[PDB]
């Protein structure tokens, strides 16, 4: 995308979202990141939406194929599951590479730095979902380390109702429950996050209240499933 203007890449990413062309959207946003400038709040959201949709389709396909493969146990199911898995890993490596070159190092404000470190935790988490063995251990630790740095910043620099802080806590709790075999840590984090947000809702406008309570309901939904 080197020959396209940054502003045109951003405009086309928004059009691709409306057209539900998420692979295109991700390619446009990768091109925008590679222009080398920092991303605004809205541009960060476009980057995240694009790749979340791409990797989300891959994860859903991998789960279907992994289930069929487990039931079977010719080479075809394993070969095709491996093909999807390699593609998924490639997308995760691409996102992680954008974060490392050079989005995180240039992110100084809490809102940008927390957002990117949460993304780093998420994409290592998606790698962990398909990893097998000792490779799994180092990938799991990379996810944990990114989430933990984001949590430390968010608790120092953001109010407990901030939607990014809430979504980080939600996703770190899912990491604990689904990846790290720590369901008690997942439940404790979700409960403490919910309760501290509740106590801060009185400070918010009607619109901010709506944004925060929407994510709080997701924390509650997980707590209901886990307890």
């Amino acid at each position: 995308m080197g020959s396209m203007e940054r502003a045109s890449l951003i405009q086309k990413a928004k059009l691709a979202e409306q057209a539900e062309r998420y692979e295109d959207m991700a390619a446009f946003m990768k091109g925008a990141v590679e222009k080398g400038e920092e991303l605004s709040c809205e541009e960060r959201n476009l980057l995240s939406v694009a790749y979340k949709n791409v990797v989300g389709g891959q994860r859903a396909a991998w789960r279907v194929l992994s289930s069929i493969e487990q039931k079977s146990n010719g080479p075809e199911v394993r070969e095709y599951r491996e093909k999807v898995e390699t593609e998924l890993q490639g997308v995760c490596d691409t996102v992680l590479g954008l974060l490392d070159s050079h989005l995180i190092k240039e992110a100084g404000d809490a809102e940008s730095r927390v957002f990117y470190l949460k993304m780093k935790g998420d994409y290592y988490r998606y790698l962990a979902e398909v990893a097998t063995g000792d490779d799994k251990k180092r990938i799991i630790d990379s996810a944990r380390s990114a989430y933990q740095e984001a949590m430390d910043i968010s608790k120092k620099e953001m109010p407990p109702t901030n939607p990014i802080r809430l979504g980080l806590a939600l996703n770190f709790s899912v990491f604990h429950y689904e990846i790290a075999n720590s369901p008690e840590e997942a439940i404790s984090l979700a409960k403490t996050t919910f309760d501290e947000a509740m106590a801060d809702l009185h400070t918010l406008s009607e619109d901010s209240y709506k944004d925060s309570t929407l994510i709080m309901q997701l924390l509650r939904d997980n707590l209901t499933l886990w307890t």
């Binding site: 476009l46 939406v49 949709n53 899912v174 886990w226």
Partner: peptide
């Protein structure tokens, strides 16, 4: 369980 859906801007 459920992470941030995050599939719509």
């Amino acid at each position: 369980a459920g992470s941030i859906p995050g599939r719509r801007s």
